[PDB]
């Protein structure tokens, strides 16, 4: 009982629009795609990376240390 007749109430506003057949669908895709990514990646490259960055360190530390005490046990296997 919440179809397109009865919802919120609004007043004094206006909007315009064309058709699709009187326009082209590629307005400078090449020369506007790159700047958007350039401006937005900077903002959230800092918000997804640093949490993930402290796993590379612990993983490499553990891997190389275990490799030592598996491939180089005869170092401390003193005769």
């Amino acid at each position: 009982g919440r179809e397109f007749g009865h919802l919120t109430r609004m007043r004094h506003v206006i909007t315009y629009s064309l058709s699709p057949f009187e326009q082209r669908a590629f307005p400078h895709y090449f020369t506007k795609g790159i700047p958007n990514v350039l401006r937005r990646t900077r903002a959230c490259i800092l918000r997804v990376a640093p949490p993930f960055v402290v796993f590379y360190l612990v993983y490499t530390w553990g891997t190389q240390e275990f490799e030592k005490s598996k491939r180089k046990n005869p170092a401390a296997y003193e005769n």
């Binding site: 004094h12 506003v13 206006i14 909007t15 315009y16 629009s17 699709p20 326009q23 669908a25």
Partner: protein, 106 residues
């Protein structure tokens, strides 16, 4: 295969091999030079016979290799040109709504 190192004990029936987890296995060496004769006219060296054996064995373990990499190729060419179509029909439809201006007058 290699001869056993110094200071290592081994079983009488056991022969030294460095590729084994136990570092020794009951495999009495069955493969060496000129144990066979290749009827096709090939100088039978150990390496060549071992290579032919391995190429036979994998095929026996999974024969669908050759019938796989061909449908895996007639899938990309056909798809790789239909899919760039659907995109265009999309753009048409969503291109009604990215062109509207929205002014306010109280």
């Amino acid at each position: 295969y290699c001869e056993p190192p110094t200071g290592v004990s081994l079983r009488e029936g056991l022969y030294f091999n460095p590729y084994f987890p136990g570092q020794a296995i009951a495999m009495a060496p069955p493969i060496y030079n000129e144990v066979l004769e290749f009827d096709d006219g090939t100088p039978a060296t150990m390496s060549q016979v071992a290579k032919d054996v391995c190429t036979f064995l994998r095929w026996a373990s999974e024969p669908e290799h050759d019938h796989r990499k061909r449908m895996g190729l007639k899938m990309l060419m056909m798809m790789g040109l239909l899919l760039p179509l659907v995109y265009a029909m999309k753009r048409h439809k969503w291109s009604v709504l990215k062109s509207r201006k929205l002014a306010y007058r109280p």
